[PDB]
Ligand binder design. Sequence first.
Ligand code: ATP
Ligand code: ATP
Lengths: 214, 72, 131, 122, 247, 120, 270, 73, 73
Amino acid sequence: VFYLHSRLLERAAKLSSLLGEGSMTALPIVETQAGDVSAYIPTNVISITDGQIFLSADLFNAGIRPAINVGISVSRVGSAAQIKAMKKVAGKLKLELAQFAELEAFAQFASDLDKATQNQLARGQRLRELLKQPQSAPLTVEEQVMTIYTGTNGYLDSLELDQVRKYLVELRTYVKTNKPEFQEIISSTKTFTEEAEALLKEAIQEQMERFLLQ
Amino acid sequence: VSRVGSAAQIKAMKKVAGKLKLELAQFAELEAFAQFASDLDKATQNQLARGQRLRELLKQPQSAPLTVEEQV
Amino acid sequence: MTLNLCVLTPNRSIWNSEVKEIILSTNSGQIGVLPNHAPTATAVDIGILRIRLNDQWLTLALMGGFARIGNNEITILVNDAERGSDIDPQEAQQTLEIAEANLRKAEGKRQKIEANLALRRARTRVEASNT
Amino acid sequence: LQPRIVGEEHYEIAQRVKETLQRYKELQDIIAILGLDELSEEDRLTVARARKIERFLSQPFFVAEVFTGSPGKYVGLAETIRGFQLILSGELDSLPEQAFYLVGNIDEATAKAMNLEMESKL
Amino acid sequence: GLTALTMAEYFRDVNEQDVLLFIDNIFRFVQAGSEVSALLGRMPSAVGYQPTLSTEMGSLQERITSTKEGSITSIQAVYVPADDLTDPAPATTFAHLDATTVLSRGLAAKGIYPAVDPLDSTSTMLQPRIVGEEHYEIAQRVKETLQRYKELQDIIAILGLDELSEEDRLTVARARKIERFLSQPFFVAEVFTGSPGKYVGLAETIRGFQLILSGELDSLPEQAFYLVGNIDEATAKAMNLEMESKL
Amino acid sequence: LQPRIVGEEHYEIAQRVKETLQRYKELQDIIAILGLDELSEEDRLTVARARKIERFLSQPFFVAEVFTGSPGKYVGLAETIRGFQLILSGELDSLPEQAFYLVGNIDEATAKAMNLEMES
Amino acid sequence: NLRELRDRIGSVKNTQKITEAMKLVAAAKVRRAQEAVVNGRPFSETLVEVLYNMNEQLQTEDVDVPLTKIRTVKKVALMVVTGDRGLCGGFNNMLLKKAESRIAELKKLGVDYTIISIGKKGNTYFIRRPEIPVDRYFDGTNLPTAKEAQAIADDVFSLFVSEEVDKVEMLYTKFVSLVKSDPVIHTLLPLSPKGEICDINGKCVDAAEDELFRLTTKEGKLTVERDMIKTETPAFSPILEFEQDPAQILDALLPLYLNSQILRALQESL
Amino acid sequence: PLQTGLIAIDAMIPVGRGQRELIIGDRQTGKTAVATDTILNQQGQNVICVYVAIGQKASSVAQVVTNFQERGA
Amino acid sequence: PLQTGLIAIDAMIPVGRGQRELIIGDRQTGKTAVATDTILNQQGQNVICVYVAIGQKASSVAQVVTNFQERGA
Ligand SMILES: Nc1ncnc2c1ncn2[C@@H]1O[C@H](COP(=O)(O)OP(=O)(O)OP(=O)(O)O)[C@@H](O)[C@H]1O
Ligand SMILES: Nc1ncnc2c1ncn2[C@@H]1O[C@H](COP(=O)(O)OP(=O)(O)OP(=O)(O)O)[C@@H](O)[C@H]1O
């Protein structure tokens, strides 16, 4: 079975320059029974593959959809396969999520923690609201950069824990309609530049004001 | 469990104890869960005491049968 | 000379300013302070403390204590104090009402003495509040 | 259980029910060790509501009469959605949890609360 | 693995060169032998490995020695399945291993490269009668300081670093100095970083930690020990940083 | 262990010892993490009685005298039932635990207790 | 079952995280309590200054005091200060046994013993017990900051003015060391003319034994350290003027000291 | 970069072109959900999607095929 | 007696001649160390010593026999 899976999986890889730079991403699926991820076929596919996107039913019931497990999931390709804008925002995003993952056991005690860890809990709490997505509604890289920037900079501390999703969807639509330079900038350069940073700050505060006047 | 239910009793024992198994299981919960709470409200405390009386009732010695009149 | 106002509750310093004109009551009755008010030691009753820096005299209540208005220092040790405008006159009157009602229920002796004290402390609250 | 198929109200109420039960189960062992007093207002609140919801998802069955003793109740989808909306919003947030046990509708649960309230007064 | 072994073994049996034999990784060779035995139809041992796990591991782990001619040093990766150190494959591999160096994501995420944790990593070679009493005592004091730092990790944040006693303030200070001096500019990571590669013998190492930990270089900035070769280059960088801080 | 065979007193004291040891076995999971401090008055009572009981069950043997050094005691039913009656009544509640460890009679337990109070 | 074992192990790990975080939370609360008592020191210290100025100026023969007169003990008011929370080791039980011993001693002397239950665990303990005499169950909900101190002050004032419950003694746990602390008994009433806290029978000066403890770390683990800098009052220019007779003025001053002592005791027990 | 359309994946678990990224989960955690999410994201850029169902319901294959039909992918 | 020469064993666990005793423990706890200790402590006593090594590392066996040659034991 290991020979089978190894041949089938390793048939898919990024070809060299002379052969045409063709490629073939294998996105296989294995289902794990009762969280026994160290079973035979799970450990086989985990050994052969590069990355593992681990899905958890306790997050799935808790509302956090897609229910990926961010502390367990890994990808040994890594930021090499990221847009420059995406990696610029993703570094800060990963650090913030690591922090809130450490502070997870301090949310009940949000009454007598120092205000700094209180605010880290607040940011991670909003960031959990950021990452949820509706069913089969995929985003573009530029809209995702919008969302991660709004989150990581600190522009959602004001709105309460639930409105964040509606606020962010309204943000994306307003930017799309009224500042069409951002998506063009990122489509051309694929780099988060200070001009698009200022443009996004402007659009963000505009949408925030009109949404708050609601 | 008993997959026959009240049809394995008589009308008298059914009238006296139709709901008793579900109420006794729910009271096993209520008495098992109210060890965490410090102070209880009076309704729950009285249900807990009655369930404990019920638990003392079901003790039966060896070689002792109870008739249907005594059971009812 | 020009004297300083550092009043203080048991745990902190309620008001640490250096203000001009200060008029607070006492056990004997009513007194006041002008800068360089002579060496004195007065146990202020449960009585409002109007406190006038140059423009404003906003009434700062208190539940009783002891003052020392001597050389360049006016320190008022108070068991509990709460300013005038800070307490709202409506709930202040509400406390006044329920306190008078408890004074009606003052049948016991120690109950009646504590009723008097709680009533008067709740009273000076309202006496500073709505003004 | 998808919005376009079941209606947005049915979907949102299903998601909220699952959320409160999952919060309860993720909290239950921490409570079992620690104690119940030491939880926040919203934590104790959701615990009470989730116990009540766990009661209200019970129902007397038409064929289980020999097992329960009560008569079976057919409960409609509108009645279910309404009752769970109420129990989740906290209208019934003072009724006995046991009033939510083996009841078909939500008016039956209110009437059973009335019966237990009178039984306590006697 | 046997192919790589014999190609290495020539290099020291005939040429008497100090060879390094990297095997990445041992667990997959173990399970490949398990698959071979499975296809051959021989009855399995415990939890699912081949019956000759010990003898098969020996056949590869006993050509790796230091003979009169040369020495093969085997730096092999190991993988623990189901987090077992007691699964037959990890147990048998550890029965052969002599020292383990453990790399942690913490030091990688922070920036102390290489990301070796000096506490999770251990050696059986760090006995006094093998390495010298001076090396042993300096290593012990360094481990004690770093461990006390891990113990104070939560305490200092709440208490404030000033409210600590003088001994514990000294401990956290020297612990930061030590943990930063553990960083090294690599010969092969200069292409990425830009810092020239450096080589530090044990003389430089033991004396550098003696100076840092003995309270003598306790007057240097934290950054003056970071990604530096030895204590001499540490002093050089410290003088640079102080001149750069004056003006 | 049935009254028709062993006498009602023997049977009753055996049931009470089994009861109390069961309750301590239950509370073991709690006390492992918490400690005895967090228990109720009746819970801590049962736990102290169970400690005394599970130590009073111990008896030095004649054939283990080479390992323990202590002369083995022979103690039959007339003293067994009485000693356990006393321990579960709680008259001996003032005694420590080590007084019941490695003794044959409840009298030897009490004498060891008097020694543990002679050594101030 | 493997699922069940993994579940129970995840449960124990959840418990480890919960309790490990509770440890840091309790340390932060200790730090805030320390930061509160150092700020509460000016009130009591300045009042001790002015109060020993009083027995230097009036030379101690001008006193006729409600809160100092000793009417022989006939009914006693023993104040039980108990922590509200739980899982705090045996801090509650230690003083809820000290009170049993102390009452079993003075129960033949002070025929009626009045327990004042300040806290929450005591309010459970005495209602579980068959009704020990309890005047006002003091518990904490926005009270413990200031309203609790003031309410204790009011209760002991009303109880002492009609002099039946004399010899008021409060029970608390001065946190001398972080690991060990035992419930002390300090006679608060009758208040002494000089500012010495009344020990057992009121005969011992406790100004030196009273200490303020602050957090630091002996080489291995964090531990409290006993820290004190205290002197005696100066004259403060006894030419000072009394607005009334110093008898009534000290009668109006003693409620302030009566308040401050109780507030600092409720910080020490906290 | 192969943009999957999920903020979480495209930020924290970056998938590339020629990378064998495994999706692993329990029953009904959304594995096929993330798969269709990616396939439907890749309308814009020029890739060919392949979906190999092994041992699934013909009704489930019918659902996913009809979905791609009404979506345009 | 079989004087093992170790303080703790000779105090608590007296090993006499003709008595089969077990040395059990984790990896790297000192079992071979105490073995070599006891064999070296039979230099005065008349007892000849035997040591077998079932599947031990060749470097370990070489170190053992080298120490025995060094002591002359
Ligand atoms: N990100 C999401 N947001 C909202 N709902 C989701 C999400 N992902 C999945 N769902 C819902 O969860 C249900 C299960 O999804 P899906 O069928 O993709 O899981 P699965 O892992 O393929 O299940 P199985 O393992 O049985 O094949 C779907 O009906 C879908 O409505
Ligand atoms: N009493 C001792 N004093 C100092 N060092 C010791 C002592 N005992 C053992 N050691 C050291 O500990 C290391 C392990 O010792 P030893 O070889 O006896 O363990 P082992 O049980 O044989 O290991 P394994 O179980 O892997 O065979 C050796 O390097 C040895 O130098």
